[PDB]
Design a protein around this nucleic acid. Structure first.
Ligand SMILES: [Mg+2]
Ligand SMILES: [Mg+2]
Ligand SMILES: [Mg+2]
Ligand SMILES: [Mg+2]
Ligand SMILES: [Mg+2]
Ligand SMILES: [Mg+2]
Ligand SMILES: [Mg+2]
Ligand SMILES: [Mg+2]
Ligand SMILES: [Mg+2]
Ligand SMILES: [Mg+2]
Ligand SMILES: [Mg+2]
Ligand SMILES: [Mg+2]
Ligand SMILES: [Mg+2]
Ligand SMILES: [Mg+2]
Ligand SMILES: [Mg+2]
Ligand SMILES: [Mg+2]
Ligand SMILES: [Mg+2]
Ligand SMILES: [Mg+2]
Ligand SMILES: [Mg+2]
Ligand SMILES: [Mg+2]
Ligand SMILES: [Mg+2]
Ligand SMILES: [Mg+2]
Ligand SMILES: [Mg+2]
Ligand SMILES: [Mg+2]
Ligand SMILES: [Mg+2]
Ligand SMILES: [Mg+2]
Ligand SMILES: [Mg+2]
Ligand SMILES: [Mg+2]
Ligand SMILES: [Mg+2]
Ligand SMILES: [Mg+2]
Ligand SMILES: [Mg+2]
Ligand SMILES: [Mg+2]
Ligand SMILES: [Mg+2]
Ligand SMILES: [Mg+2]
Ligand SMILES: [Mg+2]
Ligand SMILES: [Mg+2]
Ligand SMILES: [Mg+2]
Ligand SMILES: [Mg+2]
Ligand SMILES: [Mg+2]
Ligand SMILES: [Mg+2]
Ligand SMILES: [Mg+2]
Ligand SMILES: [Mg+2]
Ligand SMILES: [Mg+2]
Ligand SMILES: [Mg+2]
Ligand SMILES: [Mg+2]
Ligand SMILES: [Mg+2]
Ligand SMILES: [Mg+2]
Ligand SMILES: [Mg+2]
Ligand SMILES: [Mg+2]
Ligand SMILES: [Mg+2]
Ligand SMILES: [Mg+2]
Ligand SMILES: [Mg+2]
Ligand SMILES: [Mg+2]
Ligand SMILES: [Mg+2]
Ligand SMILES: [Mg+2]
Ligand SMILES: [Mg+2]
Ligand SMILES: [Mg+2]
Ligand SMILES: [Mg+2]
Ligand SMILES: [Mg+2]
Ligand SMILES: [Mg+2]
Ligand SMILES: [Mg+2]
Ligand SMILES: [Mg+2]
Ligand SMILES: [Mg+2]
Ligand SMILES: [Mg+2]
Ligand SMILES: [Mg+2]
Ligand SMILES: [Mg+2]
Ligand SMILES: [Mg+2]
Ligand SMILES: [Mg+2]
Ligand SMILES: [Mg+2]
Ligand SMILES: [Mg+2]
Ligand SMILES: [Mg+2]
Ligand SMILES: [Mg+2]
Ligand SMILES: [Mg+2]
Ligand SMILES: [Mg+2]
Ligand SMILES: [Mg+2]
Ligand SMILES: [Mg+2]
Ligand SMILES: [Mg+2]
Ligand SMILES: [Mg+2]
Ligand SMILES: [Mg+2]
Ligand SMILES: [Mg+2]
Ligand SMILES: [Mg+2]
Ligand SMILES: [Mg+2]
Ligand SMILES: [Mg+2]
Ligand SMILES: [Mg+2]
Length: 75
RNA sequence: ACCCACCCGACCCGUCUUGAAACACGGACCAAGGAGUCUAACACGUGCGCGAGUCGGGGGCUCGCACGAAAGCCGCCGUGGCGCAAUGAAGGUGAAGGCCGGCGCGCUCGCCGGCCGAGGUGGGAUCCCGAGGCCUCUCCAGUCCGCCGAGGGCGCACCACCGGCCCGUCUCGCCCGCCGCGCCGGGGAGGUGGAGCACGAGCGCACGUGUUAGGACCCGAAAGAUGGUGAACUAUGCCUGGGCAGGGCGAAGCCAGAGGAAACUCUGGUGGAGGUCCGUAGCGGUCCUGACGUGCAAAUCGGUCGUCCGACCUGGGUAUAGGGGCGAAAGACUAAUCGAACCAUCUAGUAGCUGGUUCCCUCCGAAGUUUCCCUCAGGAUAGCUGGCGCUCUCGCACACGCAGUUUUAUCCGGUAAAGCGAAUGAUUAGAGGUCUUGGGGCCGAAACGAUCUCAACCUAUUCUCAAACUUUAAAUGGGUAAGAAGCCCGGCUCGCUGGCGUGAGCCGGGCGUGGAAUGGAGUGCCUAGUGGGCCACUUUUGGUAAGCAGAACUGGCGCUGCGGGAUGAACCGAACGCCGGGUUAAGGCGCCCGAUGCCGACGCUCAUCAGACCCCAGAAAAGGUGUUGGUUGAUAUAGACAGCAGGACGGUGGCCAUGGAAGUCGGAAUCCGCUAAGGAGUGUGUAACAACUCACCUGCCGAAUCAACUAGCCCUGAAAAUGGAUGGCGCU
RNA sequence: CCCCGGAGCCCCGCGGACGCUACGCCGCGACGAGUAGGAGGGCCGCUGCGGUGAGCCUUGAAGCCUAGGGCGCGGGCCCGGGUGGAGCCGCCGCAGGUGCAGAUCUUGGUGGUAGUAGCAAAUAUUCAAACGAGAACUUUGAAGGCCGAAGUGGAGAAGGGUU
RNA sequence: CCUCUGGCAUGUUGGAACAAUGUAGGUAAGGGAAGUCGGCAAGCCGGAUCCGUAACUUCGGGAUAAGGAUUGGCUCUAAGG
RNA sequence: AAGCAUCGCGAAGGCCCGCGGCGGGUGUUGACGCGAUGUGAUUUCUGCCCAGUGCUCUGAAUGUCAAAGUGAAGAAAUUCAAUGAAGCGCGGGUAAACGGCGGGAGUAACUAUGACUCUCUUAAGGUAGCCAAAUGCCUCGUCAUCUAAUUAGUGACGCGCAUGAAUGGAUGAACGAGAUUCCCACUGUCCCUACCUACUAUCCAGCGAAACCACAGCCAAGGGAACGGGCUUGGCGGAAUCAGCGGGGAAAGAAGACCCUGUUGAGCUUGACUCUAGUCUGGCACGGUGAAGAGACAUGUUUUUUCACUGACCCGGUGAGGCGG
RNA sequence: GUGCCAGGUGGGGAGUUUGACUGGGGCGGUACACCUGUCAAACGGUAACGCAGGUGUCCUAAGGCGAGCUCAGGGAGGACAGAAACCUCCCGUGGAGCAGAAGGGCAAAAGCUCGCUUGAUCUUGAUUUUCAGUACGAAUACAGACCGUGAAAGCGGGGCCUCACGAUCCUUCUGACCUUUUGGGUUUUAAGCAGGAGGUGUCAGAAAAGUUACCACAGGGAUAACUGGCUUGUGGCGGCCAAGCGUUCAUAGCGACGUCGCUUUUUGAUCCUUCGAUGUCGGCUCUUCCUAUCAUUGUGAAGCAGAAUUCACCAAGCGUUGGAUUGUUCACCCACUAAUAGGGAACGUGAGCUGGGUUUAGACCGUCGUGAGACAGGUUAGUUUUACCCUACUGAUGAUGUGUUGUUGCCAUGGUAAUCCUGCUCAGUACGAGAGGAACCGCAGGUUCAGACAUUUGGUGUAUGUGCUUGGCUGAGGAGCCAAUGGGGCGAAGCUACCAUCUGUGGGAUUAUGACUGAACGCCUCUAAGUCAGAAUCCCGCCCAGGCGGAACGAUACGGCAGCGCCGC
């Protein structure tokens, strides 16, 4: 009593009932499996972003004032 | 709705199965009975109550309970359960951070005051603000009401990402603490394991589905175990009783007579031995393979047989009992039961295996493939199914994303083909080459001397090949990409990287349709059946082949009716709510049978076996002046072609072959003369000739003639057993 | 430039269905094969319980039968007539030992087979009479037969248990 | 096998026919195992008296070996107490 | 089965039962007996093989071998040591124990066989006998005989697939409901069938079952789960029945004995795995008295060896009848 | 001795086990865990007991660096030295080597030779490959240590890459001033935590021998042993071609090397059907079909003079026998014959038989097995059920119709029958050198088959006919009876036998074939239109049955109630 041994006959059909969906792409994928030495350093960089805040805020206010002067000169 | 008629349709259900009207099983008929239950445990969903709680048990207080064995209440209301905290094997430890100011050297470390208090990015239903319209019976003013709303905000839930905190663990480090300064205790930085925290969601009750444990959907073993009953049958022992015609053979002992010298021997009697013979009753049971075979009989009957004074037959009593007895041993017998009796129980024993499994409509609707399994008639796990949803989207003039497509870019490929004067391997032929050298020759003493030769090698060529070769190289095919998660500016962070710079991560602005066609998307939980398959196109391996076995690809059948294919799983057409009209497909249109009952068109073909439609149910090589087309060549007025009539020679017994071939078993040759012209000969035949026969030309007759291929129909090739099938009748 | 308790109405913002069991009612499109399997709805069906129908019932309940009348796609249902002779149903809830064609199913019943197979072992019966409703079979008589003293005869044992 | 003593009514029925198949009996011309797996089945033989008796042998048997003849009825004779 | 032949046992024994007993059977017995096996009267034989597996005999000369006991170190649990029973090993016997019993080459003044020789080999290498046997594949062996004809029968032959000596060989009168072959007789066995009898079957009166049963019942062909009663296409089809018949209903009978599957069994086997009654050995206990001596350690202890003793314990006898002084 | 422990022995006894896949199973293999090339249809992925192979290791270097070299092969040289020793020059895309299979990869290397070495070390996660996208193994990229090597850049955490390996439990070793060893403390011990090792090859991992013919149970047509299907290799039969054979001559008869077919009376494949059973070989008996024709009829051919013959055509009407051995099929032999052709029907035919053989159980022998047991090795003994149903067939009553009845008839359709031989004659003739040796027409008979019949012969005989005879019984005689038909002679009638006797017929159409006239094709041709002869064939005749088919004719209900036939209206 020998069987059928293997096949792939009805399988494509079976797969395509429910699509063959592409793998759901997000923005902001994880940093799992990224070269450790990198990840330390981007972690440290992220740690000290709040250091150098007061400088950054002022720079944007100076930029915003320069934009407001430019738009007044245009109008 | 009862009966009858007629036309068309129409095989018997159930079931296992790839496939059932089956020569697969179950089913004579009717009634009643008859199979997914209950308990427990889990999980998810749903409904209700309360909610950081919830809870009810168990107990108690209220009644003789009619209704109550209820109902109510309880600092027991919470002992306690579950929940509200984890993590570590454990000793144990145990979920906060930020900011600001100050003091220690701001040392991305240690200590003291103030403020905020569960971080941030992107997307987010929804709210909020809202420039601005858009009018009002006039020109302006102008509060009220809307409608829309560009633009901008707070952003639930949820998702993705990055930070953070707790426990385990590692690595590196530097400080704090005190009743006990210690092999004491506490912290930091950076990874990494945790069923964690990051303003809670549980508890109880109820219903549903699923999964289990239980007799566990219902029915079914062969077995296993405990405790009992039987020797009235039969097996063997023992006790006490009963039973066995008539004949044959004639053992020991005995007598007489005769012989013998003795030993003893003969002859005639008598005698009546024996697991002796015949043969009755008895006991048995050979053959007829007789009778019977739903019997007279759950083993009988008839004849024929074996034995019939002995290991004989036989009554009653008595002994031996179940892994035990008893056995002249056949695994025989042990109450119609024996390769382990019977009875009751354990027991509703177990069953991956048969069988069955009860009303209607509606909607969705499979699989026979995965990996694992003492797995291959079963499970597990993926897959395919359903159910419950949720989150968003906008036809409410104002859309994003997704696809069994295609387009434009761009990579991938080594199959078909092709190639072998390219590699690898195979392989033919001759040219050329003392390449090498040989082995065999012939002419050489021998000599790359001359001449051949065959070996391998080589120089150009040449024949033919490859699933496990290839320089080339398709078609079909597989990725990506075709924008807001995108571009373009400005600035900050780094313990990484570094002459300066990289690269990454952060903030803050600035810019909108970015190929065709179509379509509303996303997302989570429970989840059944299935895990025997088969069939066709094309591709394809094994095999002589198979209605054989095995893959790929799509589509079928299985699950599925309907028109066609006469008939039919699977072919072709087409996929079904119940009906009227119309129109089609694939198929048809002599009659069966709806439609050609057309003045249908043009050919082909006659068969003493005609032929007549995918799958398909049947023929080949090879033949045929049968007939019809082609193709190529001829021929012929220098009047042919056939049809009849006249000659077929000589050089020449040509040469090889003698065994005879002067043309003639065969073969190398193979030309001249006469010529009008005859082959050194097509055959007949001869031992060998001879003789005969087979061009070139005329005479007659009077226009086409003839050859070789080729392909259409038809025919030969063509033989099977019940009588027979283009479906039938038939048809020219 | 006036008020609908009155414009008279194709729109009426003063009040609003014949319609509105909002688990209702209505409108537009599309679609409809189905085993195994899943889910939904059943004013389908059975039996019992709490409610409820001032239900039904000897002026006839249940069941049974019906070439009667109907409804529903269907599960089924309702009426008429007959039969019967004592109980029974509708609705809202709850509960289940809840729906059969099959199981070589269980128990009971009934057919076809069929007036069929069959009533054939062991030689044998006949005549007259009696009784009697009735005689192939009883009894009596007569004849013809068999068992043929290892008996189909005459007596026990065991077993039966009144034969 | 037939009879007396004693006992029965032909074994759970009767009648009418006399087909095929059977079951149980018989018989067959000529041949005689040609039949058939095989003389299965049936047939031959059979009592008694008188003769006659092989191979072989465990000397006992074989042995009713085989093979032959006779057998009735009647009327007498002889022999046995 | 008689006959033959092995084997165990002198009774605190052999063999065996039993759950247990100062239990029981053999046994009311004693080797001319009890118990266990083979072979199978007589006659005549009974070859070789002790390598294998069995069984058995011996046993400080001795490898291993348990618990207890002895010593050792350790705080102790302990470990280590020496000691050392049967059993295995080690060494003898045993085949009327299971069983076993060869293969190459060459060789004789015609050829052929091979007396003879040469090897290689085992525990021996099949002896006497016997044979195509109930044992021989090839096989219907070859020769003879028996028949007209013989895969049969008999007699011979023997590199015998794969004979063979109490796994008994060869024989053999008598006997056999045993297996064959031939001959004589006899026959319906047959050529070749026929006629007769009785009881049936038949028809009737009375009486009266059963199995079986989806529906049913005329064929050919087709297709079809590849042999249809039903379907397609053809042939066709006429009530109700009687006696027969065995073609068909793939007729009935019985959930296939075969075969295969099942993680279903049972009977039996053993070199399966895991145990176990029984048995053999060692230890401790009931277990005492005396003598003697002997080693080992130590400078008393332990081991005890042998020889007595009787009081436990046992056995036998008896109507416990005379015992010791 | 008993009690209790210890070790041995212990199929006497118990319990249990005795894989899987598999063109049924068993035997054999391993396709059971891995790897290469192919299969594979140019992404990947893919099957079979597909193909060709490899694996259970090997390495202290064959691992890691760095340096330097260049390999196979060939040419040309050089004392001994030759095809091969050593040296030297040239060419050399790798044709070598790189542990092993193969594939890839590799030249100032991944090869060889040196120098120094232990990156084959310690430790987190991520990823790939198998994948369920779990494990194992194997690998990839990092990251942190500590090293190696190199001037350095770098490379290196095993082997250039693709295979070489193993869970839970248990053990063992290594590791930390580690945790626990529970009323506390110290110490041994044990228990944890983390990493290696001891193995499961049936490789995601039970601990495991047979036998059963004394057997059982659940099932299976998922699967064998028949038929039947498909196929036809194999067997059987038949073409085509034509090198040869046939003295000569390819083809009278043959036919190599090649080739194309049919057949399912061979055997295989295969497994579709049947395992809630389709009775498993042979023989007997009986019917029917096929033809691939042995004989018989009619014919063509010859290497046919005659006789004998083989080759072919129409053709299956009619035949195809008796025995010996064997269970046989098959085989062989004897005999006859005209001939002793071949098959089919579920390998026709078991409710038809038989049962000899296969194939239960009883037994023997050989070989095999320790044994239970085994043996397409031999032997012997071994239960063959049921029909009354339906159909089919056989015969038997009937049926509807015709007004009823009877008569004598016709005939639709079915069936169907004759066969072959000898002798005589032709005739010792044709023919032939002879040897030998036919035929047509006649005539006489016989075989097998069919249909009858009984005068005769035979058989039967229960006329229970008539004798005769046994045993018994009616007292005897006479007359009888009984003994399942007492026995036996003879035997009427009647059945009945190649065991007696009789009878068995004629046409038509044509087939194969051979011919006519005669074109096609100025001739010739059997043919194309036309015509002839023609047969065991076929159809009818005769012969049998006689239709839900008819025919002519007869009589048609006196009656006691009757009832009808015509005619006309
Ligand atoms: Mg499968
Ligand atoms: Mg099944
Ligand atoms: Mg099947
Ligand atoms: Mg069905
Ligand atoms: Mg069928
Ligand atoms: Mg079944
Ligand atoms: Mg049935
Ligand atoms: Mg019911
Ligand atoms: Mg819930
Ligand atoms: Mg679940
Ligand atoms: Mg359950
Ligand atoms: Mg049960
Ligand atoms: Mg058991
Ligand atoms: Mg019998
Ligand atoms: Mg009968
Ligand atoms: Mg009777
Ligand atoms: Mg048993
Ligand atoms: Mg049950
Ligand atoms: Mg299973
Ligand atoms: Mg759905
Ligand atoms: Mg490829
Ligand atoms: Mg190619
Ligand atoms: Mg299955
Ligand atoms: Mg298959
Ligand atoms: Mg199915
Ligand atoms: Mg539907
Ligand atoms: Mg369903
Ligand atoms: Mg009453
Ligand atoms: Mg109830
Ligand atoms: Mg019912
Ligand atoms: Mg009757
Ligand atoms: Mg009496
Ligand atoms: Mg009688
Ligand atoms: Mg009577
Ligand atoms: Mg009686
Ligand atoms: Mg006779
Ligand atoms: Mg014969
Ligand atoms: Mg014979
Ligand atoms: Mg006899
Ligand atoms: Mg004799
Ligand atoms: Mg012996
Ligand atoms: Mg020995
Ligand atoms: Mg043996
Ligand atoms: Mg010998
Ligand atoms: Mg004979
Ligand atoms: Mg002999
Ligand atoms: Mg022997
Ligand atoms: Mg001996
Ligand atoms: Mg022997
Ligand atoms: Mg049928
Ligand atoms: Mg029949
Ligand atoms: Mg049957
Ligand atoms: Mg079965
Ligand atoms: Mg069974
Ligand atoms: Mg299994
Ligand atoms: Mg068992
Ligand atoms: Mg063992
Ligand atoms: Mg056992
Ligand atoms: Mg298997
Ligand atoms: Mg591809
Ligand atoms: Mg280098
Ligand atoms: Mg290397
Ligand atoms: Mg590193
Ligand atoms: Mg303490
Ligand atoms: Mg046996
Ligand atoms: Mg067997
Ligand atoms: Mg036996
Ligand atoms: Mg099958
Ligand atoms: Mg020639
Ligand atoms: Mg077959
Ligand atoms: Mg049958
Ligand atoms: Mg023919
Ligand atoms: Mg047959
Ligand atoms: Mg039959
Ligand atoms: Mg039979
Ligand atoms: Mg037999
Ligand atoms: Mg037997
Ligand atoms: Mg009858
Ligand atoms: Mg007288
Ligand atoms: Mg009598
Ligand atoms: Mg003609
Ligand atoms: Mg004519
Ligand atoms: Mg004629
Ligand atoms: Mg006729």
């Amino acid at each position: 009593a020998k069987s059928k041994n293997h096949t792939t006959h009805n399988q494509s059909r079976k797969w395509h009932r429910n699509g063959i969906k592409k793998p759901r792409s997000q923005r902001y994928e994880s940093l799992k499996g990224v070269d450790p030495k990198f990840l330390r350093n981007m972690r440290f960089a992220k740690k000290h972003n709040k250091k150098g805040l007061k400088k950054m805020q002022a720079n944007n206010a100076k930029a915003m004032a320069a934009r407001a002067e430019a738009i007044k000169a245009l109008v």
